[PDB]
Amino acid sequence: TVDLINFRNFGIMAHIDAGKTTTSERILFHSGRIHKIGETHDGESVMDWMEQEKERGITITSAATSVSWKNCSLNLIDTPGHVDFTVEVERSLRVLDGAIAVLDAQMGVEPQTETVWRQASRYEVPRIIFVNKMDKTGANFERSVQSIQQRLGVKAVPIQLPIGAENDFNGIIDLIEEKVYFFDGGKEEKAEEKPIPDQFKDQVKQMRAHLVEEVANFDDQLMADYLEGKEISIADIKRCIRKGVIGCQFFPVLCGSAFKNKGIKLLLDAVVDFLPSPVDVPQAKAYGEDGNEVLISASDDAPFVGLAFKVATDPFVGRLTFVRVYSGVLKSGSYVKNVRKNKKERVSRLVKMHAQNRNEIEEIRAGDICAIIGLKDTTTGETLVDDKIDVQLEAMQFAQPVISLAVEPKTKADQEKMSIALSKLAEEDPTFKTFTDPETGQTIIAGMGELHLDILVDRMRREFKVEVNVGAPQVSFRETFNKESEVEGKYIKQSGGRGQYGHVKIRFEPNKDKGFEFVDKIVGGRIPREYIKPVQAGLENAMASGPLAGYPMIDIKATLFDGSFHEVDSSEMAFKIAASLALKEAGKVCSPVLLEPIMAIEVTVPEQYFGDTMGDISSRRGLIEGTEQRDNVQVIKAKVPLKEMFGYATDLRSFSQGRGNYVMQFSHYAETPKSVVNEIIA
Amino acid sequence: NIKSNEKRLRQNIKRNLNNKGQKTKLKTNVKNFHKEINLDNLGNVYSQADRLARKGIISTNRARRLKSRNVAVLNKT
Amino acid sequence: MKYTGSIFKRSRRLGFSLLENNKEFSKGKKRKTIPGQHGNRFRSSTMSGYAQQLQEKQRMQYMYGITDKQFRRLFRLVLKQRGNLAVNLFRVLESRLDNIVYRMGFAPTRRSARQLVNHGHVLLNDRTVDTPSIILNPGDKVRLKAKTIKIPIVKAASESGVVSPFVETNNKTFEGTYVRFPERSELPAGINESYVVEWYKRL
Amino acid sequence: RMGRVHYPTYRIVAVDSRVKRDGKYIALIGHLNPALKENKCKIDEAVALEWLNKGAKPTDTVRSLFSQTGLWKKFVESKK
RNA sequence: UCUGAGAGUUUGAUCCUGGCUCAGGAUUAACGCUGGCGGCAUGCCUAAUACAUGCAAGUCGAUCGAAAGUAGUAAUACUUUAGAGGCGAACGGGUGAGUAACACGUAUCCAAUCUACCUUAUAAUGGGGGAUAACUAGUUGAAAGACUAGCUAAUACCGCAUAAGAACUUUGGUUCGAAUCAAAGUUGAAAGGACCUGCAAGGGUUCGUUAUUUGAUGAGGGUGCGCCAUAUCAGCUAGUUGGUGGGGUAACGGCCUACCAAGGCAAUGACGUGUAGCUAUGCUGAGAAGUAGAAUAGCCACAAUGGGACUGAGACACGGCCCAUACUCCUACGGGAGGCAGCAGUAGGGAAUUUUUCACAAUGAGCGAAAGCUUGAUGGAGCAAUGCCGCGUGAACGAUGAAGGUCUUUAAGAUUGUAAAGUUCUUUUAUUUGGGAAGAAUGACUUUAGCAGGUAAUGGCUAGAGUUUGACUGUACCAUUUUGAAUAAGUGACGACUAACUAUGUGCCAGCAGUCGCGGUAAUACAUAGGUCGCAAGCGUUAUCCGGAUUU
């Protein structure tokens, strides 16, 4: 195979609405150019007629697509297609030895590239900023370099000057290389380089001084050379940019287009120049859940670790699980050990699904990605081993899809199908969580954004072939009540097993947050002890159910009042049933009240929709006594009802471009307002 | 799939061409005998049939029966 | 049950003393009938040929301590050899490894004998049995392994070994030879296997 | 071999050019275990001669068992 | 004779007529409940539906030219054959759609039939001519593919020499629809590659072919006997029916046809109809008989359905070919493609029917002097108590059995129960130690003694001696290898049929239930606490055939 230095992974490190998947498909076709099948004229050009971006995000989603490009192996992985979430972008980041950040110039108002950049900046992985929106009505180059700063502020040093910047991008002026144009719209194969002429020698020279004034600080002999007027050598410039991407000092902001499809040649050139081997890249950390949560490296060496970062379903050939090889060689043809399951599993064949093929293979070296065809028991984060390396079970690097939407139960077949559907979606995301309301025998779906929910439903309905009614979210709706009166109970018999009689008086006492407590007032022998231990049997069982719809009857006190005395019989469990029915009737007639969560919101919104979110919460009738200040965001300490919480993230985002975000802390249960409680009383 | 199946396919298609030629030669010798009925053509048919039976394509029973039917016509003349 | 955990119950209720004065024994309470709140002469027709066939089968397969599946296996294995079902079946059942080890006087109880022989310390046909499933034949030498020549309970049992007109045991060397089958006169007096013979109607 | 694992039982049969073991046979050669070095096969210096003189030589794994009986020492000169 | 269960069902009661049920082995099982191991064997009945994926017979130079390079200047020592050509390719396995019949069981007619290697061995490997791939060039080409142009080898294509024997003409002889032999006509066998000795010839030496020829091998048509249903199907059948001649698969056969024809089967129900794969093997019962011939051994059938041809000895060929019909990938819409009723495995119905299985270790073939290779056949293994099999959840002493469930309801007691407090002891399954496999220790390969055509020459038969070979398995078995009572329990129901029941709610409500039938003014059949017996790592359940019903 290709050398270990040449095993570099690259995940599409961006979000949709940015021309993301168009660029991903363009890169996949550019590095996967094969002519013996006629593909060169089958995927020649890629561009949008965009009225829907979910199709672009889903159909082009490359879970693991490996190809080779003359010097190296390019592992293009377009797992993210959601606008804002963590699992797909995070697995792409973990896999990739270098990152490509797809940014915009026509729409610089995209809100969900800051968190993506922050995720990629955790491991210091090399990043190349590439902009493809420079082919519309309203794009620019100054817009690119200003949006890359106001959104992020990473000092993106422009090594590429776009010849064509609004709707005519067809050339690039380079510093490490020479100026280049693009005569080939759509499919690109040639970088039409041109020299530095007299009309542009100063144009390139000013930015050369710009770049060497930064590069001079590194390797201070360069600073001295600048004293003596010696321009920094291009090799030193390249090494310093490599350090500034793997060390996050400064990154080049390239330029390109995705609708005339210009600017992918020097894109890949700079990717190769600055995104190095899986040993030069700062390796991502792995805290194995099996007790070895320590800082470890991912350098290429003898020990082998195999992490299944993606899965897919197929009945005929078996499950197709995409794995990333971080170190060593993955053995096959025998029993492979799963440390997470801590057992050896018998495997038959292994595979790799490239951009256009499923090659049946057995081994992929570190820095690259592989797959197993079959292996119906695998999870995202597991470690397949053969040399008995340490554990790397990763589950903390991913976060929760927060904001709930209820799902109601129906006939057996669909619910049984969605059982395995959710279970197998939990191995596609180790933090994909779901709730189960007491009012439903089914799950509660979780998402925050419109696109995240749509793509989760798409994964539910495409890979698993199942769809449901996503109902309005509901509450556990706990049950208390207010002052209620005395009730009475009797049981009389003469036939049957034997005659048994009981006659008791009981009252059901309210509380708010104090649970079951007993208040007894029986003194005088009006009910003997033989009929005393019976009646209490009917008390506690009254706390286990609600009279409206089975809601939990918690935080409620029950009080025994009186019984009855008799000589010729009137035995015990007659008193038991009398007390039980007395408690039940008192619970019936209590006219209860309910409890729901009204949560204090820690609203962390950037200071462009602070007023918009302020007005939104005022419409939601919150308690905004003030607002604490932060770096670029304001945090409102407010209150929001759970009813207005349903879609709160979605509505706030629809009113604020999606940058207005949400931080939600769970609060103690409080009395339901008069409007909410009376719709449930029955 | 067995590669030897296609190997014997190659061999048997070439045998198809060769045996078509040889059986057509034998049948045209038989036709010549049936046109000019004489002992010389009977001997030519005998030689051709002996050659084909020696080659081992079809069993000698067919050769013997065809030449017996030919010499029956010989006795009819 | 192929087992117990209070044998004295089985001995008393079955009407046959599995131990003569060590299982129907005055150890506090002592019984000879069905115990509990249902000790009663059932006026319902609980008595027939079926009932006493069952009862004799219970007595015989509970004095041995063996499972009923091996009872049926022994029946089937004897069916390979022509003869008389009753005497041959009872003699083969008596020839059980655990039953013969107890008959040697090597264990105070059939359950204890079964546990000991299973423990991997009984040599028969030069094979230390890890499962007491080897049916003996006249002259089969059962040997006590080097382990069970130092065990106090079975030491005391062996030193009090039992000899019968159809077996013998050398207790000092912890060995036993099954001399012969109990043919028709060395069988227990209150036990009759003929009922199990008549218990089938598919012969 | 066949039967139960670690207790193999080899049933030796005849063949001409295509048939398997213990299926369609001209005549059952006999029974040898791969773990047993002595055969209780139907070998009596006569059936082997019958199989050799009738053509369709049987399975080629009891040749040593026929060699011990001197089958070849007479057949290689009978054919000669 | 091995051998054979009863009871319950009617009128006030009695009996009779008749019927039903449980009472039995047994699972492709499943199923509740839980669960010890391993051995062991089982494992889509339904779906013959597409089959994705790997796989389901490979071996060949001791047949050849060159390809093709390691060392060599090259020749060449050397690697196999892309290709020509050889065998096996029809093996194997699969299911049984369909097939009810010579397929079968059996003796056969084969007078009509071949069978490659093999086999009984007589005859041969004399001599060539010229191609053809390989090689080379061009062409169409995204590839798929694809045409043209030439050269050359052989074991390659095509004649002849000899050619016993033999095919086959005419005469005689012999013989139960021909057996047998004499005379005599015609007529044809290629092809040599390779190793030691020998100048060569020749001898030894290994392959490839040749005829002749005893059989096997697979099978051909018929074949008496028996071979599912089919009257709430009575007429059916125009090669129908047979003959002369001619042609014909391997051949007799209207196999088929020209000619000549009107008959053939049939109330013992013809024809038609759809089905089952047939025998051995699979259970029940004493028996009568019933229950499958799934898968399997033999035979038989498709091998996605229906044809055609070729090869091969045998195919009109699952995994050859061409095609029509079902399907399909990619694509520039020009184009090319194939079959798990092979193994698995997938999709489904179902209760479920195994690995998307490992080595050919041993066994089969095939072929190669030989090293050997592949088998998804085989041998293993997984797999689900999947079924069977055995195992252990203690024992001993110790009380009037201390706790308590049920009864009593006082109130011990007594059931559980020597279960316990109390004292110890035992360890397969709990648990570790090392020995650690048998199975290669087979075919094959190599030294040799004898034999041995030769032994001038290398080699071959028997054997001495060695080579080497695991799917398993640090498995199996051994030894308290060490501490320990510790490591495992559930089910039915207790009114009878047919063992296991006392009380509590319950007024024919609750709910039980295979038959009788259970509960409407105090429930041992219900529900439960409990005790109880039958069992048991399996327990109960239905499923399925006969006998218990002679009660067809």
DSSP structural state of residue A157: B
Residue A10, φ and ψ in degrees, nearest 5: -145, 115
Pairing type for strands A593-606 and A518-520 reads unpaired
**Structure tokens given for A440:** 């439903």
Using the CA of D56, give the nucleotide whose C1' is nearest.
Answer: E118
Nearest partner of A322 among A368, A265, A256, judged by Cα = A368
- Are the C-beta atoms of residues A629 and A623 closer than 8 Å to each other? no
Residue A537, φ and ψ in degrees, nearest 5: -60, -30
Alpha helices in A216-291 (DSSP H): 221-227, 234-246, 265-274
What's the rounded Cα separation, in Å, for the pair A656 and A652? 6
Cβ-based neighbour number of residue A354 at 10 Å = 17
SS3 A247: coil
What's the rounded Cα separation, in Å, for the pair C55 and C61? 10
Cβ-based neighbour number of residue A300 at 10 Å = 18
**Burial class of residue C101 (count of CB atoms within 10 Å of its CB; 0-12, 13-18, 19+):** buried
Long-range contacts of C156-163 (CB under 8 A, 24+ apart): C156/C108, C157/C105, C157/C106, C157/C107, C157/C108, C158/C104, C158/C105, C158/C106, C160/C105, C161/C104, C161/C105, C161/C106, C162/C103, C162/C104, C162/C105, C163/C105
Residue A637, φ and ψ in degrees, nearest 5: -90, 95
Tell me whether residue A59 is annotated as binding.
no
Look up tokens 């039982």; give the residue: D9
What's the rounded Cα separation, in Å, for the pair A416 and A570? 51
- Are the C-beta atoms of residues A191 and A209 closer than 8 Å to each other? no
Q: Domains of chain C, with CATH numbers?
A: 7-92+189-199 (1.10.1050.10), 93-184 (3.10.290.10)
SS3 A306: strand
Nearest partner of A595 among A679, A676, A682, A514, judged by Cα = A676
Residue A181, φ and ψ in degrees, nearest 5: -110, 175
- Helix A265-274 and helix A20-31: axis angle, to 10°? 80
- Rounded to 5°, the CA angle A646-A647-A653 comes to 150
**Protein-proximal nucleotides of chain E (any atom < 7 Å from a CB):** 2-5, 24-25, 39-41, 52-60, 83-93, 112-121, 142-143, 157-160, 167-170, 185-189, 209-212, 214-218, 246-252, 284-286, 296-299, 309-315, 317, 319-321, 330-332, 334, 345-347, 355-358, 361-367, 377-382, 388-401, 405-407, 414-419, 424-429, 437-444, 450, 460-463, 470-473, 475-480, 485-486, 490, 494-502, 504-507, 521-523, 530-537, 539, 547-548
SS3 A133: strand
Rg (CA), chain A: 33
- Are the C-beta atoms of residues A21 and A78 closer than 8 Å to each other? yes
Q: Which residues lie across from C169 on neighbouring strands? A: C176
User: What is the amino acid identity at position D33?
Assistant: N
Give one DSSP letter per residue of A520-583, joined into a string.
E---SSSS-GGGHHHHHHHHHGGGS--TTTS----S-EEEEEE----SS---HHHHHHHHHHHH
- Are the C-beta atoms of residues A79 and A61 closer than 8 Å to each other? yes
Give one DSSP letter per residue of B2-39, joined into a string.
-HHHHHHHHHHHHHHHHHHHHHHHHHHHHHHHHHS-SH
Cβ-based neighbour number of residue C12 at 10 Å = 21
Nearest partner of A563 among A540, A532, A587, judged by Cα = A532
Give one DSSP letter per residue of A603-621, joined into a string.
EEEETTSHHHHHHHHHHTT
DSSP structural state of residue A333: S
What's the rounded Cα separation, in Å, for the pair C194 and A465? 67
First to last CA, chain B: 56
Q: Which residues lie across from C29 on neighbouring strands? A: C27
What's the rounded Cα separation, in Å, for the pair C182 and C188? 10
What's the rounded Cα separation, in Å, for the pair A600 and A625? 12
Residue B51, φ and ψ in degrees, nearest 5: -60, -45
- Are the C-beta atoms of residues A298 and A125 closer than 8 Å to each other? no
Resolution of this model in Å is 15.0
What's the rounded Cα separation, in Å, for the pair A375 and A308? 10
- Helix A198-215 and helix A234-246: axis angle, to 10°? 50
Nearest partner of A379 among A423, A330, A347, A328, judged by Cα = A423
What is the total residue count of chain A?
Answer: 682
Long-range contacts of C160-167 (CB under 8 A, 24+ apart): C160/C105, C161/C104, C161/C105, C161/C106, C162/C103, C162/C104, C162/C105, C163/C105, C164/C103, C167/C100, C167/C103, C167/C104
Look up tokens 């070095």; give the residue: D37
**E strand intervals along C84-201:** 122-124, 127-128, 141-144, 168-170, 175-177
Q: Which residues lie across from D32 on neighbouring strands? A: D10
What's the rounded Cα separation, in Å, for the pair A439 and A459? 26
What's the rounded Cα separation, in Å, for the pair A307 and B59? 66
**Structure tokens given for C109:** 């109880």
What's the rounded Cα separation, in Å, for the pair C5 and C10? 10
Nearest partner of A505 among A516, A518, A521, A492, judged by Cα = A521
**Structure tokens given for C178:** 């099954």
**Structure tokens given for A223:** 């600073």
- Are the C-beta atoms of residues A312 and A63 closer than 8 Å to each other? yes
What's the rounded Cα separation, in Å, for the pair A358 and A405? 38
Q: In chain C, which residues from 174 to 193 place their CB closer than 7 Å to nucleic acid strand E?
A: none
What's the rounded Cα separation, in Å, for the pair A445 and A403? 9
Give one DSSP letter per residue of D8-50, joined into a string.
E-EEE---SSS--SSSS-SS--EEE-TT-SS--SS-SSSHHHH
Domain chopping of chain B, boundaries: 1-77
What's the rounded Cα separation, in Å, for the pair A450 and A654? 9
**Structure tokens given for A108:** 């610089």
Helix (H) or strand (E) holding A350, with range, is strand A349-353
- Rounded to 5°, the CA angle A619-A624-A627 comes to 125
Cβ-based neighbour number of residue A637 at 10 Å = 15
User: What is the amino acid identity at position A387?
Assistant: D
Measured between alpha carbons, how far is residue B43 from residues A242, B28, B38, B76 in Å? 94, 14, 9, 17
What's the rounded Cα separation, in Å, for the pair A362 and A317? 16
What's the rounded Cα separation, in Å, for the pair B13 and A357? 36
Tell me whether residue A17 is annotated as binding.
yes
Tell me whether residue A82 is annotated as binding.
yes
Residue A189's region, left for phi above 0, alpha for psi from -120 to 50, else beta, is alpha
What is the total residue count of chain D?
Answer: 80
Q: Which residues lie across from A444 on neighbouring strands? A: A406, A435
Which chains have 3+ CB pairs within 8 A of C?
none
Neighbouring residues of C36: CB distance < 8 A, sequence distance ≥ 6? none
- Are the C-beta atoms of residues A589 and A507 closer than 8 Å to each other? no
Q: In chain D, which residues from 21 to 80 place their CB closer than 7 Å to nucleic acid strand E?
A: 21-24, 26, 34-35, 37, 52-61, 63-64, 67-68, 70, 72-73, 75-76, 78-79
Residue D74, φ and ψ in degrees, nearest 5: -105, -35
Nearest partner of A541 among A583, A502, A572, judged by Cα = A583
Q: Which residues lie across from A74 on neighbouring strands? A: A8, A67
**Structure tokens given for B24:** 């057509």
Neighbouring residues of C144: CB distance < 8 A, sequence distance ≥ 6? C106, C121, C122, C123, C154, C158, C174, C175
What's the rounded Cα separation, in Å, for the pair C173 and C177? 12
SS3 A101: strand
What's the rounded Cα separation, in Å, for the pair B39 and B71? 9
Tell me whether residue A81 is annotated as binding.
yes
- Rounded to 5°, the CA angle A134-A137-A142 comes to 50
- Are the C-beta atoms of residues A275 and A10 closer than 8 Å to each other? yes
Residue A72, φ and ψ in degrees, nearest 5: -145, -175
Would you say the C-beta of B46 is within 7 Å of strand E? yes
What is the total residue count of chain C?
Answer: 203
Neighbouring residues of A424: CB distance < 8 A, sequence distance ≥ 6? A311, A313, A464
- Are the C-beta atoms of residues C2 and C68 closer than 8 Å to each other? yes
- Are the C-beta atoms of residues A129 and A267 closer than 8 Å to each other? no
DSSP structural state of residue D66: H
Residue A446, φ and ψ in degrees, nearest 5: -130, 130
Burial C149-173 (b: 16+ CB within 10 A, else e): eeeeebbebbeebeeeebbebebee
What's the rounded Cα separation, in Å, for the pair A447 and A405? 8
**Structure tokens given for A620:** 């939601």
Give one DSSP letter per residue of A384-428, joined into a string.
EESS-PPP----SSS----SEEEB----HHHHHHHHHHHHHHSSS
Cβ-based neighbour number of residue A88 at 10 Å = 24
**Structure tokens given for A375:** 């292996």
Cβ-based neighbour number of residue A660 at 10 Å = 23
User: What is the amino acid identity at position C182?
Assistant: P
Long-range contacts of A312-318 (CB under 8 A, 24+ apart): A312/A63, A312/A463, A313/A424, A313/A463, A313/A464, A317/A358, A317/A373, A317/A374, A318/A373, A318/A374, A318/A375, A318/A376
What's the rounded Cα separation, in Å, for the pair A555 and A383? 46
Pairing type for strands A633-641 and A593-606 reads antiparallel
What is the CA D34 to C1' E9 distance in angstroms? 66
